[PDB]
Amino acid sequence: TVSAPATYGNFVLSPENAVTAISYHSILADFNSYKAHLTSGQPHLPNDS
Amino acid sequence: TVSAPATYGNFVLSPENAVTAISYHSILADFNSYKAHLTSGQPHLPNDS
Amino acid sequence: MENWSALELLPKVGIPTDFLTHVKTSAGEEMFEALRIYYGDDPERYNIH
Amino acid sequence: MENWSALELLPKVGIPTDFLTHVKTSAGEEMFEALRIYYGDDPERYNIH
Amino acid sequence: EANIFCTFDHKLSIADVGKLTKLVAAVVPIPQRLHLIKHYQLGLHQFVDHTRGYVRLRGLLRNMTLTLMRRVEGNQILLHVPTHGLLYTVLNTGPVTWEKGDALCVLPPLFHGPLARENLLTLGQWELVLPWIVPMPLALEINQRLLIM
Amino acid sequence: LSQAGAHSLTPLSMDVIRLGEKTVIMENLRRVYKNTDTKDPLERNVDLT
Amino acid sequence: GTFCNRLEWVYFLTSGLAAAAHAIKFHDLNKLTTGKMLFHVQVP
Secondary structure (H helix, E strand, C coil), X not given: CCCCCCCCCCCCCCHHHHHHHHHHXXXXXXXXXXXXXXXXXXXXXXXXX | CCCCCCCCCCCCCCCCCHHHHHHCCCCCCXXXXXXXXXXXXXXXXXXXX | CCCCHHXXXXXXXXXXXXXXXXXHHHHHCCCCCCXXXXXXXXXXXXXXX | CCCHHHHHHCCEECCCCCCCCCHHHHHHCCCCCXXXXXXXXXXXXXXXC | CCEEECCCCCXXXXXXXXXXXXXXXXXXXXXXXXXXXXXXXXXXXXXXXXCCCHHHHHHHHCCCEEEEECCCCCCCCCEEXXXXXXXXXXXXXXXXXXXXXCCEEEECCCCCCCCCCCCCCEXXXXXXXXXXXXXXXXXXXXXXHHHHC | CCCCCCCCCCCCCCEEEECCCCEEEECXXXXXXXXXXXXXXXXXXXXXX | CCCCCCCCCCCCCCCHHHHHCXXXXXXXXXXXXXXXXXXXXXXX
């Protein structure tokens, strides 16, 4: 017997991604983490989006 | 006696615009105003950037 | 070319733009750089890539 | 034709790697769609326009 | 049976799908009338062959069926065969001025003069050449004039 | 030379086969030439004329 | 007088093929065109 998830891995979109989606037809997923880790200085993320 | 402004107004680049400057080669001025008045629903800004 | 969905969907600023000639004259005599007129109401704003 | 400046400047997530063949053999033999193999060091990631 | 899907071997960039999304409700002919097609028979560039005859293309494009392009969202172009009688909206790229009374007939695109020859979608061996929609007096004048030739 | 150093020690894990009261350390040298340029020198060409 | 009664239900997660899948439910794929997830590797 193995354990496997019963529900899908839901994934939501930030409104900054909505503004970039309207404007430049592009999404940088988990945009808030990219913004904070750019302006702070740490260049290595914990996880991906 | 007219009243002119003292100094040039400063247009400082918000941290929400750094990722757009680096990745997409564009700046959308006061990204926070666009996000707030887009997700809020009302499509009329009070004043421009 | 310059995407006009970023004009149509993004929230704009209300303004009393009172220019002296007719709007279709200032279009058809090319006083502006790049026009985009539609005489209907086209759904090309909605194909958000 | 891409934005490799966004690949070199944005903060990244780390991975344990395991390529199939050697990586430079995967470069010269066109395994992917878009590759940017430059030797030495290239300062092309700085002209932010 | 009403909607005809298609696909490319390439993928479609935002520049290319931005060139293509302007062509909603544009007329595109189909040589075959089947449900799923390839893009190597879509349009007319499968059949164009210079030093063979403009009149052969005039007799051949006359024989294909006609569709209207809409609802493009990624590897789906969705040609839609028009039923016999309902009101449709079309879009022309052939530069002729129109009139509310004048009817329409399809012609192969002759060269216009400026050496532009706009193809609006350029792939590795296949461009997209588009059928002209022209009013009825120019169609009758074209047919009688090349019969005079 | 044996007076020079070997002060302390650390634990680490590796594989060992028992060969007649002589235990030897099995070790693949894969990870030291994983994606590198110089050749794995345990590879060799031999000639039989 | 009868019709079909004897079927069963099957899901994507309860089948053993889901070990090759990271199932993401994302309600906006009909607007998405291409999702690129691009790497940068340096060589030792």
